[PDB]
């Protein structure tokens, strides 16, 4: 919230022009979105889960965080020099994590120092802090971490490592069990002031506002659904 705790090391070496989106509502780049959002598979095409859920150990290589079925890296401590603008973690409710030292004491140096870190280490609520985080790296790429995602079972070519609510494929793949970030379902992700910056291809998603319980406590948030 304090603007001084924002990692703000932004570097437009490629001249993609992503910095304007930090300031202005109409300057998110949804070019290339219709074709890439076609890569994403609807949940219908994945195999049917079965058996007990185990947490997945892998870090599969896609680097395409724009799909709902993207299995994220687990959250760690990342240095402020890799971050541009606010880091949002999802509890499900959106929350901003500020720049800090390795212990968690707040620092106020714009992330311009080497001690400045963003400690995103996630343990899923209700006991933990959040489910996942999203942020823009210093050269204009969306980065996301969280989970670990779930082994839901299945057999074959197609098999879902679920990072969201996947009730369709397995009855117990709830968001509390497998939620790994902003995607609440294959259809909805949490709306927050920089969703269009981080997820420009959700531009046409319609805003439903949502009420949602994670371990007793109710969460009161707007979701953008297709």
């Amino acid at each position, epitope marked *: 919230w304090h603007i001084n705790r924002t990692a703000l090391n932004c570097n437009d070496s490629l001249h993609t022009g992503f910095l304007a989106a*930090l*300031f*202005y509502t109409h300057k998110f780049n949804a070019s290339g979105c219709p074709e890439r959002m076609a890569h994403c598979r609807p949940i219908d095409e994945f195999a049917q889960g079965w058996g007990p859920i185990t947490y997945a150990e892998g870090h599969g290589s896609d680097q395409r965080p724009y799909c709902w079925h993207y299995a994220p890296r687990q959250c760690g401590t990342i240095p402020a020099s890799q971050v541009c603008g606010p880091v949002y973690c999802f509890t499900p409710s959106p929350v901003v994590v500020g720049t800090t030292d390795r212990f968690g004491a707040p620092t106020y140096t714009w992330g311009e120092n080497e001690t400045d870190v963003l400690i995103l280490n996630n343990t899923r609520p209700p006991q933990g802090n959040w489910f996942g985080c999203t942020w823009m790296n210093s050269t204009g790429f969306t980065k996301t971490c969280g989970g670990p995602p779930c082994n839901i079972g299945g057999v074959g070519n197609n098999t879902l490592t679920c990072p969201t609510d996947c009730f369709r494929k397995h009855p117990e793949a709830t968001y509390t069990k497998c939620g790994s970030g902003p995607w609440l379902t294959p259809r909805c992700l949490v709306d927050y002031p920089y969703r269009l910056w981080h997820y420009p291809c959700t531009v046409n998603f319609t805003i439903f506002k949502v009420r949602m319980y994670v371990g007793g406590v109710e969460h009161r948030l707007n979701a953008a659904c297709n």
Partner: antibody
Amino acid sequence: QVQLVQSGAEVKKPGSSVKVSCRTSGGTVNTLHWVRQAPGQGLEWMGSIFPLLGVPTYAQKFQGRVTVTADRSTSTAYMELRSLRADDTAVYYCAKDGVGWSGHGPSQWSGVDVWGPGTTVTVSS
Amino acid sequence: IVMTQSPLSLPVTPGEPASISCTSSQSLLHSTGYNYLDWYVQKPGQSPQLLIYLGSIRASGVPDRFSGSGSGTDFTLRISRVEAGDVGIYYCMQALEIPRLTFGGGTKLEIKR
């Protein structure tokens, strides 16, 4: 009620460099701009900078002979045009848009609503 | 994006209305639902000055007798009771490509005698 106070006129000779200054007074800005106006000709954007980030953008016509920089502590931004030519005599306007990043979300465009008084730069031998 | 303007010179009898057109090489209408075209006036001797932003909103100190309309690629600035004060050059400018601005060649408002 941000004001933009600019450095005074400059009589330069062909080949040399000028560094025009612009100081935001009484608030913050999303982005400074440099727009110039050759005698009798129109308005030409040259470059701009987000003073928060300190990252500038340049028009192609001046790429390589202009640099825009923004000193944070003094709330002063500079524009330096080098290899000056008689073609470069003009009034040099810095102009802003925005009040600065709210730190919570993007803002809506509200125009280039504040212009400085201009800097007259003469290039002649 | 290229901003061309018409007319270049506009002689206007005082109190009579005035109108000046701007066209954009590409549509200035955005996902958000706003047209990102501004209108500026430079009165002789003075700095450029903002008149109208986002197609239709008029800036601080700007009277109701200035109105901007238009959508996509065709826009118009209309001035209803032209006065000797209004003389100057009127510029449109697209803001779809900020930080980069691109201005039109300008339209000269001129009192007819």
